[PDB]
Design an enzyme around this catalytic site. Structure first.
Site, PDB file in Angstrom:
ATOM      1  N   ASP A 191       1.222  -4.133   2.164  1.00 47.46           N
ATOM      2  CA  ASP A 191       1.935  -2.864   2.343  1.00 47.46           C
ATOM      3  C   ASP A 191       3.406  -3.095   2.674  1.00 47.46           C
ATOM      4  O   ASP A 191       3.984  -2.417   3.531  1.00 47.46           O
ATOM      5  CB  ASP A 191       1.277  -1.989   3.416  1.00 47.46           C
ATOM      6  CG  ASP A 191       1.724  -0.539   3.334  1.00 47.46           C
ATOM      7  OD1 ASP A 191       2.319  -0.147   2.298  1.00 47.46           O
ATOM      8  OD2 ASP A 191       1.484   0.201   4.316  1.00 47.46           O
ATOM      9  N   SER A 202       6.505   4.211  10.159  1.00 50.37           N
ATOM     10  CA  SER A 202       6.188   3.021   9.384  1.00 50.37           C
ATOM     11  C   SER A 202       7.485   2.360   8.916  1.00 50.37           C
ATOM     12  O   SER A 202       8.468   3.040   8.593  1.00 50.37           O
ATOM     13  CB  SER A 202       5.294   3.381   8.194  1.00 50.37           C
ATOM     14  OG  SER A 202       6.004   4.057   7.184  1.00 50.37           O
ATOM     15  N   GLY A 235       6.028   8.886  10.308  1.00 47.24           N
ATOM     16  CA  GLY A 235       7.402   8.666   9.889  1.00 47.24           C
ATOM     17  C   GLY A 235       8.062   7.441  10.487  1.00 47.24           C
ATOM     18  O   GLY A 235       9.267   7.234  10.269  1.00 47.24           O
ATOM     19  N   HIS A 249       3.868   1.804   1.012  1.00 47.35           N
ATOM     20  CA  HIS A 249       3.371   3.169   0.891  1.00 47.35           C
ATOM     21  C   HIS A 249       4.467   4.206   1.110  1.00 47.35           C
ATOM     22  O   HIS A 249       4.262   5.368   0.758  1.00 47.35           O
ATOM     23  CB  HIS A 249       2.172   3.399   1.834  1.00 47.35           C
ATOM     24  CG  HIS A 249       2.529   3.630   3.275  1.00 47.35           C
ATOM     25  ND1 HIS A 249       2.479   2.631   4.225  1.00 47.35           N
ATOM     26  CD2 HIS A 249       2.847   4.768   3.943  1.00 47.35           C
ATOM     27  CE1 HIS A 249       2.795   3.136   5.409  1.00 47.35           C
ATOM     28  NE2 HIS A 249       3.019   4.434   5.267  1.00 47.35           N
TER      29      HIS A 249
HETATM   30  C1  LIG Z   1       0.321   3.162  -2.182  1.00 49.08           C
HETATM   31  O1  LIG Z   1       0.137   1.768  -2.055  1.00 49.08           O
HETATM   32  C2  LIG Z   1      -0.308   1.352  -0.802  1.00 49.08           C
HETATM   33  C3  LIG Z   1      -0.433  -0.141  -0.507  1.00 49.08           C
HETATM   34  C4  LIG Z   1      -0.916  -0.622   0.861  1.00 49.08           C
HETATM   35  C5  LIG Z   1      -1.273   0.436   1.950  1.00 49.08           C
HETATM   36  N1  LIG Z   1      -1.733  -0.029   3.252  1.00 49.08           N
HETATM   37  C6  LIG Z   1      -2.066   0.940   4.283  1.00 49.08           C
HETATM   38  C7  LIG Z   1      -2.550   0.468   5.652  1.00 49.08           C
HETATM   39  C8  LIG Z   1      -1.924   2.438   3.991  1.00 49.08           C
HETATM   40  O2  LIG Z   1      -2.259   3.348   5.000  1.00 49.08           O
HETATM   41  C9  LIG Z   1      -1.941   4.733   4.663  1.00 49.08           C
HETATM   42  C10 LIG Z   1      -0.365   5.065   5.013  1.00 49.08           C
HETATM   43  C11 LIG Z   1      -0.355   4.681   6.236  1.00 49.08           C
HETATM   44  C12 LIG Z   1       0.501   5.507   7.311  1.00 49.08           C
HETATM   45  O3  LIG Z   1       0.314   6.672   7.536  1.00 49.08           O
HETATM   46  N2  LIG Z   1       1.497   4.727   8.059  1.00 49.08           N
HETATM   47  C13 LIG Z   1       2.205   5.351   9.211  1.00 49.08           C
HETATM   48  C14 LIG Z   1       3.394   6.235   8.882  1.00 49.08           C
HETATM   49  O4  LIG Z   1       4.141   6.686   9.707  1.00 49.08           O
HETATM   50  N3  LIG Z   1       3.611   6.489   7.485  1.00 49.08           N
HETATM   51  S1  LIG Z   1       4.907   7.456   7.098  1.00 49.08           S
HETATM   52  O5  LIG Z   1       4.760   8.801   7.716  1.00 49.08           O
HETATM   53  O6  LIG Z   1       6.190   6.926   7.585  1.00 49.08           O
HETATM   54  C15 LIG Z   1       4.839   7.653   5.296  1.00 49.08           C
HETATM   55  C16 LIG Z   1       3.536   8.139   4.644  1.00 49.08           C
HETATM   56  C17 LIG Z   1       6.147   8.108   4.671  1.00 49.08           C
HETATM   57  C18 LIG Z   1       5.676   6.642   4.512  1.00 49.08           C
HETATM   58  C19 LIG Z   1       2.467   4.677  10.569  1.00 49.08           C
HETATM   59  C20 LIG Z   1       1.527   5.885  10.481  1.00 49.08           C
HETATM   60  C21 LIG Z   1       1.701   7.138  11.368  1.00 49.08           C
HETATM   61  C22 LIG Z   1       0.731   8.084  11.507  1.00 49.08           C
HETATM   62  C23 LIG Z   1      -0.650   7.975  10.818  1.00 49.08           C
HETATM   63  C24 LIG Z   1      -1.051   9.330  10.175  1.00 49.08           C
HETATM   64  C25 LIG Z   1      -2.545   9.306   9.723  1.00 49.08           C
HETATM   65  C26 LIG Z   1      -2.751   8.179   8.659  1.00 49.08           C
HETATM   66  C27 LIG Z   1      -3.652   7.072   9.301  1.00 49.08           C
HETATM   67  C28 LIG Z   1      -3.712   5.804   8.438  1.00 49.08           C
HETATM   68  N4  LIG Z   1      -4.553   4.884   9.149  1.00 49.08           N
HETATM   69  C29 LIG Z   1      -4.999   3.677   8.467  1.00 49.08           C
HETATM   70  O7  LIG Z   1      -4.920   3.589   7.276  1.00 49.08           O
HETATM   71  O8  LIG Z   1      -5.551   2.654   9.280  1.00 49.08           O
HETATM   72  C30 LIG Z   1      -6.148   1.679   8.576  1.00 49.08           C
HETATM   73  C31 LIG Z   1      -5.266   0.461   8.406  1.00 49.08           C
HETATM   74  C32 LIG Z   1      -6.364  -0.400   9.002  1.00 49.08           C
HETATM   75  C33 LIG Z   1      -7.106   0.855   9.412  1.00 49.08           C
HETATM   76  C34 LIG Z   1      -2.288   5.246   8.205  1.00 49.08           C
HETATM   77  O9  LIG Z   1      -1.586   4.958   9.132  1.00 49.08           O
HETATM   78  N5  LIG Z   1      -1.794   5.100   6.786  1.00 49.08           N
HETATM   79  C35 LIG Z   1      -2.595   5.467   5.518  1.00 49.08           C
HETATM   80  N6  LIG Z   1      -1.466   2.902   2.694  1.00 49.08           N
HETATM   81  C36 LIG Z   1      -1.138   1.906   1.663  1.00 49.08           C
HETATM   82  C37 LIG Z   1      -0.650   2.397   0.287  1.00 49.08           C
END
Ligand SMILES: COc1ccc2nc(C)c(O[C@@H]3C[C@H]4C(=O)N[C@]5(C(=O)NS(=O)(=O)C6(C)CC6)C[C@H]5/C=C\CCCCC[C@H](NC(=O)OC5CCC5)C(=O)N4C3)nc2c1
Ligand SMILES: [Zn+2]
Length: 195
Positions: free
Chosen positions: A97, A155, A153, A73
């Protein structure tokens, strides 16, 4: 018909070498933009946890077993910038992911954990080392919950065991009222399978 997406670019690292964990920036916004378009990154790479950016997102990537791993993602199917040009993903699994490239020359890889320990530590892009109790194959609870803003930020960053082995790659946060209570991660065994 007659544009391309840019490469992922390493813009810094989390230093875990000494007594203090701290973030270091190695490339600013303008060099990042240019390097994303060219795919040519001549900067020396060090350490295990890289800070990476696209034109539009920033996040982390972690070297385990000679592969630089991060989240689909964040990276999509993008190449990563390297001294000889863009490098194609070695692993891509949208169902997990998960994406990965060959680890950069000069990087250090974390060793996959075989401890079976449930006392974990999440490393964030701000060099916070956050205690996490493992609660499942792919989940753990924060011992001290905090706003999700502090995890945004990070992940692609590692969950580590007490011995400093890699237990997993951070991919998602579970919150209530914007407060992060738990995290989801790709377990190192799921990487070792993919490997
Ligand atoms: C497109 O193809 C794809 C294939 C598979 C896939 N698989 C995923 C699980 C996924 O989830 C998305 C992105 C992450 C995320 O935000 N990842 C973190 C992060 O930091 N990203 S990041 O900022 O670096 C960024 C976006 C630059 C890259 C670590 C978080 C930090 C804060 C959360 C903010 C609110 C968000 C709360 C969410 N909760 C949650 O979904 O929980 C559920 C999972 C089981 C329950 C959440 O976390 N996501 C929502 N998208 C995908 C997409
Ligand atoms: Zn271990």
């Amino acid at each position: 018909m007659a544009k391309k997406k840019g490469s992922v670019v390493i813009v810094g690292r989390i230093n875990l070498s000494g007594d203090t964990a701290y973030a270091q920036q190695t490339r600013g916004e303008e060099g990042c933009q240019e390097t994303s378009q060219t795919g040519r990154d001549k900067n020396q790479v060090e350490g295990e946890v890289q800070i990476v950016s696209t034109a539009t997102q920033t996040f982390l990537a972690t070297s385990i077993n000679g592969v630089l791993w991060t989240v689909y993602h964040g990276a999509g199917t993008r190449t990563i910038a390297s001294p000889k040009g863009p490098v194609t993903q070695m692993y891509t699994n949208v169902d997990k992911d998960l994406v990965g490239w060959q680890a950069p020359q000069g990087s250090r890889s974390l060793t996959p954990c075989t401890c079976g320990s449930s006392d974990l530590y999440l490393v964030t892009r701000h060099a916070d080392v956050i205690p996490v109790r493992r609660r499942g194959d792919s989940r753990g609870s924060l011992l001290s919950p905090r706003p999700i803003s502090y995890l945004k930020g990070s992940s692609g960053g590692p969950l580590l065991c007490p011995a400093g082995h890699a237990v997993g790659i951070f991919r998602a946060a579970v919150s209530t009222r914007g407060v992060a209570k738990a995290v989801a991660f790709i377990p190192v065994e799921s990487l070792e399978t993919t490997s």
